[PDB]
Ligand binder design. Structure first.
Ligand SMILES: CC(=O)N1CCC[C@H]1C(=O)O
Ligand SMILES: CC(=O)N1CCC[C@H]1C(=O)O
Ligand SMILES: CC(=O)N1CCC[C@H]1C(=O)O
Ligand SMILES: CC(=O)N1CCC[C@H]1C(=O)O
Ligand SMILES: O=C(O)CCC(=O)C(=O)O
Ligand SMILES: O=C(O)CCC(=O)C(=O)O
Ligand SMILES: O=C(O)CCC(=O)C(=O)O
Ligand SMILES: O=C(O)CCC(=O)C(=O)O
Ligand SMILES: O=C(O)CCC(=O)C(=O)O
Ligand SMILES: O=C(O)CCC(=O)C(=O)O
Ligand SMILES: [Fe+3]
Ligand SMILES: [Fe+3]
Ligand SMILES: [Fe+3]
Ligand SMILES: [Fe+3]
Ligand SMILES: [Fe+3]
Ligand SMILES: [Fe+3]
Lengths: 246, 246, 248, 256, 256, 248
């Protein structure tokens, strides 16, 4: 049972900053293990190509289809230039995703836009006002792709894996749209605005501003994530994405 | 994915008090799941016999040998009347134990002795002074039965499962004896006294005083536990113990 | 002196969730005592009519009238009994009537899941922790109210608590039953004070939102907390509450 | 409602240090009210005599006489460290609240320092925030306090109700065992607990109650006034068994 | 070493409220020392004139003159809400620290209230505990402050070093953008950041810095004295654009 | 003005773990600055001799002498250079010598894993949070020391910190190099004050224990922290430290 050296990202002890030499010396299982309790791994100054990226992520499990190039294409949604709001990977196409990997191939002209952000949902659900948690636990959430049930919590024991799909902000091209059964439009919009503000408080929320060579690894059962908008044509933001499951 | 109603035991949110009707209505997997994150389940006023006890615990996995009667026998250690200090189940006989169940068959003349106590090791290891954690992570711990290595941490991802065997207090009949390699007798005694006091602080530590019909369930990977002495001949303290693993 | 079993509502330990059987088996004095230090009591799954509701509340003291039980049913073209917001207040400072305990029971709730909340604020904890420039206004300045001008004292030292009597301004678009002013403050200043104080008191440490379901009973100790009703201006909503008020 | 200026004594916001001039200008009702939520009031540099002390304390309610009936004469108890005594003696008075129930209840306790010499780290009067302590204690300690019968005898056994629910607080009455070597006027027991259990309970509870979050130690100086709301706190006197110590306090008690 | 009595302003223990008599009896060095760790000193009910104000502040170091050189005459700046001006005007002064570097550095800033009328909730001078805020902020905000080049122009671009490490504190110099509608004497930019990014950064940082844990608002009354250790805090003036408001402060600056 | 990368040692954010390469690449002024607000710096995995150690420390100011580098090697029948406890203190108040920075380097450590620690106390945080009856003695009472009687002031207001000079009593059985007393206090009272204050300062919030390994460098800002050496009275122990002291 090996140990990797790390520093916490959040003040709560969640998250893991890992030095690139330490990351590469470490076995796949050590990082895979650490991700379950830390939710996310941040590695800076890693110099790899797309093939080496594939070799790193494919050791963590079976690949969920292989590498998605998120390069900010004008006219697209997921591989486009706008917001991708709070979600977990996999549950809209109904494939299990355990680990999500994001590598920065090229970042130019962007310093305070285009963040990938990460939320500690288990701590947030534990600390949130009773009225927010009640809706999440007892109500039926449905999603349509731009109507089917997406279960909010799936009890894996060690965590209640969260699957949720937030509404896109006004003015951002929407890839999905949520609804809550028995809730009106006014109510669902209010709920998400309020839950969203709770989840974005700095105790649970990490914003990653990308740089060349960054690697962001997320345990898809332990956190939910978001992309912030980067709708300025001068921005080059090319990320590579890999996805594994067991 | 079902939900059981519960209240936290500790101020930190750890532990689960579950009402006996709620416990019995709940599926085995719901309780098994909750134990992974809550460490322990406390149920009061349950009226079962030893056969029903067996039927409840055996649904959680394969039985580790079947039911041990801990009835306070004068002349014995584990089934005796004195202290059993901080330990996890299974690692001295080298059998995997995932869940430990304790049911109070009969408690008479005891109100502030004979506690089974439970420690939140993952929170404690996270918050403990660096000098205590360093010994636990880097040094070799050995145990002899009254010399072999017992690994302190076994990384399961969701938790670092702890296996440790504290020294018995002076005057208590010892079933095991620990040692730390490269540490003298003075050092090892000092280490355990200091770590023991850290672990027994109320943020991480729950003491259960037994009553007829209590059921204590422990996830053996998430917590370590102890029995406090009950060396008064007037005390009747009969517990039934079951152990499961997957 | 007996004990009811309860769970706290707030992370601070304020509030009391009480099981319906535990509530009904408890003596009146036991709940009435609990309310002084816990502020509010939430009971779910009760199935009582208006007479039984009256029997429960009237045992806590002398009935304060408006005419005992007020039916808040969301009647259109009305205020208190209307469909809009009732901003932060304590009961009984507009009429000169002492109100110690306020009782709210849900007789019928339909088509509403995230609107029409009755909310509750732990004002003693909030006043103890608020920035000094907000507290200073509350403690030393004169607050007046017009019923839609008279002095309403913010604090009344009862010892165990400084009872709060305050009447917040209604949001724009919500029909006002009252209107506050602070003497020596301009209209800009009063609006800014209340907006900032409102946001402070709405922080989750001090603030509980109760979304109503059939059979819920909310009891508030009126000296210990202040409260608010959020708007429910959708015509599909049925929200019928029974209201009782007591004092000694 | 009138307001007095004060600073909190505890980090939790409990307690009230009040400047002497602010205390003297204050109405009796202002301090009496504050005491309910702050538990205790500490005033330094008050130069009063026993008559003036009496006029200050007697305004707060009916005088509870110290203890074939009473006529209002036994008002001010002089705790002057008299050898051969307990309450007015020189040893420890462990955790308790004053008075009893019904007519012998005490709401406010007043302690003024007439003369203190040769003592800098013994003889403290200490004060415990019991309501916050009971809210935060491990449940195994709280359960004993809430569900068991505590009995006391004078140095035959009588029940002392731990909690009396006044609503605003659960008024506490408890009598901790005197430490070994200290002369005892009382002895506690818990029904159904053995001597070992009771000794262990009180030791652990004591340690919990003495944590700085809930506990204030008052080291006496001439002119100090310590007022306690007896329903809100419990208190203790630490030992002063050194013959060179002069420690004379005046004690006053009131109730409504 | 001499000690002054004070109460903390913030819940974190930062800030110092000092009674006027205690301040007046205090040696200059006692307050100057306290200011380094408490950031700011608040004194109420001081009835002094501008000459006496000058004698108080000039004892703390060398007078920094307000701003073809200086001869010690431009000492006390009268901020009297003069229309058509910015610093001595009636609008917002957003987050900044006084002075600059080297010879134009300021260690202590003094603000005394000569006359305040018709204002109860506008025109505050506000104060931010930047060292605690920088220690607790999300790392994405701290990284910008630590690694990017901040430039400012007067209303051509010049670099303002965010942190100057004095050891005991990282002395902060920053100039936040004036809010829309408020007359600006300065404009910031961040090198390599766009206008959108810079606007978004300052908005988020501003909100973080204005949280009550780090932020104190001072609403002025006649006789108030606000002293700031300029290396330890940053400050702001909120707008007072109402013609009925009289708000006249005297400003003094010193350095070692 | 440059930046060294560091991690805090304490949960409060006090202390600085600095990687050996980062330490050696940093300017002296950068570490010296960091020490004022962080109290202490811990560097592991250095491999330097005594001359290099001297070069590193002497750049921080004027060398304070005892004779520059003190070899603390555990010589028997000695005190400071001995094998026993050195209780809580700051350097340089027994001789009248200003000491700003103290440097400790591990040249050789054998057979010791849980003894002989150099411990460090965050006294400014501790004094800000201590019970008022402990602080009162420290602030208003006269403390005297006998070197094995003269006044040593507890606090010296430097502005940024109140520098602490205090000399705790040695535990029974440990050879005393000094002896404290408080004027106006009896022997019972002084012993009780220190035992209770010692336990307060040893709480994990304020207290770090450094167990020594070959190549460790511990630097302390002597105005900002106080320190202690715990006993190492086992004859099998090799514990050889180099010690440097600077001031301005
Ligand atoms: C890969 C993945 O699972 N994605 C892409 C973004 C949203 C989410 C989805 O299911 O659409
Ligand atoms: C069942 C079990 O695993 N036990 C019994 C007590 C100690 C531990 C052991 O391995 O000895
Ligand atoms: C005044 C009072 O009630 N006293 C005196 C000391 C303890 C307590 C008692 O013995 O009852
Ligand atoms: C005194 C001082 O340095 N001032 C005046 C206002 C802002 C700042 C400046 O403009 O530099
Ligand atoms: O581009 C990003 O920052 C994240 C995209 C993402 O979340 C996804 O592809 O699932
Ligand atoms: O008897 C008890 O309280 C616990 C015994 C125990 O821990 C065991 O048998 O493993
Ligand atoms: O929520 C409600 O409708 C009750 C609000 C209220 O305060 C009242 O009617 O006086
Ligand atoms: O002497 C004291 O310190 C207080 C004595 C006391 O508590 C009492 O008489 O009840
Ligand atoms: O007028 C104020 O409130 C302070 C003005 C100020 O900060 C300045 O002149 O630097
Ligand atoms: O830990 C050590 O040996 C150094 C202790 C010390 O303070 C000294 O030698 O002055
Ligand atoms: Fe995604
Ligand atoms: Fe066991
Ligand atoms: Fe109301
Ligand atoms: Fe007493
Ligand atoms: Fe300024
Ligand atoms: Fe030393």
């Amino acid at each position: 049972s090996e140990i990797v050296k790390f520093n916490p990202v959040m003040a709560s002890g969640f998250g893991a900053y890992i030095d690139h030499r330490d990351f590469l010396e470490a076995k796949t299982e050590t990082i895979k293990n650490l991700l379950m309790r830390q939710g996310f791994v941040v590695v800076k100054n890693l110099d790899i190509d797309s093939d080496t990226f594939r070799d790193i992520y494919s050791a963590y499990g079976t690949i969920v289809e292989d590498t998605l190039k998120l390069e900010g294409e004008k006219g697209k949604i997921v591989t486009g230039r706008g917001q991708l709001p709070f979600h977990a990977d996999g549950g809209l196409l109904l494939s299990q995703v355990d680990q999500v990997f994001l590598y920065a191939a090229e970042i130019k002209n962007v310093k305070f836009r285009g963040a990938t952000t990460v939320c500690d949902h288990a701590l947030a659900c534990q600390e949130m006002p009773a009225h927010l948690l009640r809706v999440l636990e007892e109500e039926t959430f449905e999603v349509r792709v731009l109507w089917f049930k997406v279960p909010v919590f799936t009890d894996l024991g060690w965590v209640r894996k969260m699957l949720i799909y937030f509404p896109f902000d006004e003015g951002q091209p929407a890839s999905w749209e949520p609804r809550i059964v028995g809730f009106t439009d006014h109510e669902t919009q209010a709920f998400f605005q309020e839950l969203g503000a709770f989840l974005k408080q700095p105790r649970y929320y990490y914003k990653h501003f990308w740089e060349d060579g960054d690697l962001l690894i997320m345990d898809n059962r332990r956190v939910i994530h978001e992309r912030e908008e980067f709708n300025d044509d001068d921005i080059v933001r090319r990320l590579y994405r890999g996805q594994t499951a067991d």
